[PDB]
Design a protein around this ligand. Structure first.
Ligand SMILES: CC1=C2C(=O)c3c(O)cccc3C=C2C[C@@H](CC(=O)O)O1
Ligand SMILES: CC1=C2C(=O)c3c(O)cccc3C=C2C[C@@H](CC(=O)O)O1
Ligand SMILES: CC1=C2C(=O)c3c(O)cccc3C=C2C[C@@H](CC(=O)O)O1
Lengths: 203, 202
């Protein structure tokens, strides 16, 4: 004994890290916990519900600095890199998250902290409220593409290079970047773009 | 009956999509609708996965990428995005389909060519132009998805608003903005942020 929600969640996360999402069935989980379905459902509900809890549990891995003046740009980037670290350390997690609710204790307080750091930058509400949404969406998407990946890049990269340079001039000349941009490079590139935009729209 | 063509196949599939949604689109359902055998259907379009690439590419014709007019770069970029957004909103389950798919194709590639042309015409260096295009279309697709997904806002707004203001000042103060910002308001904010940043990087 005995089944707790937190104990169920750590177990489901344990097997997600090891063997990935599709190997996370309620049956497998129930099997690991050596318990009956009934007790499992009562605690975490169904699989969507379980994922939700798993998503929230790993959010503690994300660190949101307290705002230092002079340092907003860099601090927001820290937060974002922290979120990406979480995604990279957890198989299939970005897949769990890009759909679902940070509406849970850990996500709720992480929001508060995130909103605090954003507003401190002189962003205004709509801008702060949305910016946080934008950054989160950005990081999650970039992380989904990362874990997604090979040679596709290479077959695609070459496919574009072969284009009739007379009709598809830009494509041939941009074939490289389009296809095979360093993951870290894309992240940092997108990070700067969004951050500069937020500042531009603050003042 | 007239000999099956790829385009008639694909138009019909889009019709089922639009009316009935992604999950009602099967090769069996499409065969029914077309009154043809599974061989001639497959001959033309392959499996469901391939069918979807074709459906996606055919709708891209609805998107308009202006030829660069000097003076108006920033606004023409927003124009292109609004048009791409329009297409998603006009088409059910589409943003979902686009989420794992390379536009590449007749219009797909043509519109990328035209997009990179607009981007670089703004003084964006190869790498900003290329990524900016990716970031821009990823942003539009994600907003579309979101918009389609959608009382809940009032429930969430109620919860955030009724929080201990001493514990969650920001979540209580930003209760509304967070809960719901029309899809239009979100979209434009997101556009101006990204376009301003592309300009800063250039
Ligand atoms: C859940 C959570 C966070 C977030 O959800 C988060 C985010 O969604 C987007 C961008 C940044 C963050 C940061 C955090 C930090 C985290 C801290 C905690 O709950 O202990 O709490
Ligand atoms: C391929 C294509 C387009 C695009 O791909 C596109 C885009 O990717 C992002 C934002 C806007 C657009 C617009 C178009 C328009 C269209 C080009 C054409 O075939 O005429 O078809
Ligand atoms: C969602 C997505 C893309 C697109 O959807 C896209 C598009 O819809 C029309 C024209 C071009 C594109 C390009 C992309 C690139 C990529 C972005 C990402 O997943 O980060 O994955």
């Amino acid at each position: 004994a005995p089944l707790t929600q937190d104990r169920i969640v750590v177990t489901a996360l344990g097997i997600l890290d090891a063997e990935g999402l599709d190997a996370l069935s309620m049956r497998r989980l129930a099997q690991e916990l050596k318990t009956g379905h009934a007790s499992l459902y009562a605690h975490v509900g169904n699989r969507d519900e379980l994922l939700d809890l798993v998503f929230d549990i790993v959010l503690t891995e994300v660190e949101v600095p307290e705002p230092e003046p002079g340092r907003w740009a860099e601090q927001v980037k820290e937060m974002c890199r922290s979120l990406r670290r979480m995604f990279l350390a957890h198989r299939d997690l970005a897949r769990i998250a890009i759909d679902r609710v940070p509406l849970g204790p850990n996500g709720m307080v992480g929001m508060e902290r995130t909103m605090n750091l954003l507003r401190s930058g002189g962003l205004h509400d709509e801008l702060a409220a949305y910016g946080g949404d934008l950054l989160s969406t950005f990081v999650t998407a970039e992380a989904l593409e990362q874990s997604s990946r090979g040679v596709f890049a290479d077959q695609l990269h070459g496919y574009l290079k072969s284009l009739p340079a007379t009709s598809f001039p830009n494509l041939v000349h941009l074939a490289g970047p389009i296809t095979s941009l360093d993951s870290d490079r894309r992240f940092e590139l997108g990070l700067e773009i969004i951050i500069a935009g937020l500042l531009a729209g603050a003042g």
